[model samples]
Target chain A: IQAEEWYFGKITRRESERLLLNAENPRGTFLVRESETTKGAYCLSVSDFDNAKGLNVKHYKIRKLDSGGFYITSRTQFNSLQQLVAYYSKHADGLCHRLTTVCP
Target chain B: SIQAEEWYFGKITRRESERLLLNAENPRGTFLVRESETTKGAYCLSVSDFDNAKGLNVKHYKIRKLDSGGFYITSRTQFNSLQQLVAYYSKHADGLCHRLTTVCP
Candidate 1:
């Protein structure tokens, strides 16, 4: 059995809003959406965890029933492709170990 | 007939160094100084050949004496630690291969 957790560094509120707006745009097929408009449509909801520190920590919870998948909760106001890649590379092994331990 | 022996590491002082010169058993047994990094403590010496001369068997060896009547063997592992190697050489006052041998052969 193993335990694992990961975290994003930090981001600003303006960056968070820009990310959501771009993701919701009509041409944003690659971004997260709310309905089954695409082949694999899914809903994305962001919640603010902390409000006092001018820290816009957005938590995202994803659920998929048709395809077996996992849920991810992120706490960052801004998201970058590079940052995401780096985070996954560093924590993927540890995350997989935890998932195996719990799902097995 | 030959015997195998082991020795522990020990410290040496300048005074001990002077005494070594007095008890000189074999002048050729002494080791030549080489560039070293250590400053404080007695430097350990072993009778390993630094030269890789041809026409020498891998098992064949040479003998050298030190100012302190001690003898050393020519193996890298034998001198892993200066003090330990020196102690082993000192204890084996007699030459190595001549006193010790492989029992199987």
Candidate 2:
């Protein structure tokens, strides 16, 4: 699997836009410095969650990195943070999940 | 029939084509970035395209990692239609967030 070679890094949100990507925040999802885009926010990547779970976490300690706390919630009961953000910007549905339930 | 050509043309739209152009996965095939535009993002070129002044040429059915750098995609659909292509990628992108740490971990 390691030899499969995938280049990973913090790419700009615009670059990932056309990807048809699944932000797929494993430990749930959130907005970081909610600059109004999924990529702008510090999202939980597949690797991030795996690292957390591997650590035998009983609970997650959530905090703001750049301190951009812009209204956090869920789906149905709340809604996708990315979805609502998109309504104002790109007119696409956002990734699903919660904010307070998880990390920074 | 002409109906099928119409259908094929209909299936491919400007919006989706532009979307595929910028896609990091290079969604379709070798996207000729040689110009700002290329007939719905592709050309129905022939054998001589390989024999040109430019070093660029088709490798013929070769699929390797080091091949194209976002240069090859935007050729055409891997699926039957644009919607099928959308569906294929969207499915992976959908509900992908919900899987537990076990499978991904």
DockQ of 1: 0.00
Lowest-scoring 10 consecutive residues by lDDT in candidate 2 chain A?
A: A1-10
Question: Which segments of model 1 are wrong by more than 4 Å?
Answer: A1-104, B1-9, B30-43, B46-105
- Please identify model 2 stretches exceeding 4 Å from their true place: A1-7, A21-41, A44-104, B1-105
TM-scores for all predictions: 0.16, 0.16
> Which DockQ value does candidate 2 get?
0.01
**Each model's backbone clash number:** 7, 8
DockQ of candidates 1 onward, in order? Answer: 0.00, 0.01
Best DockQ among the predictions, by candidate number:
2
Q: Alpha carbon lDDT of residue B23, candidate 2?
A: 32
**Chain B TM-score, all predictions listed:** 0.23, 0.21
The superposed Cα distance between candidate 1 and the true structure at residue B70, in angstroms, equals: 23
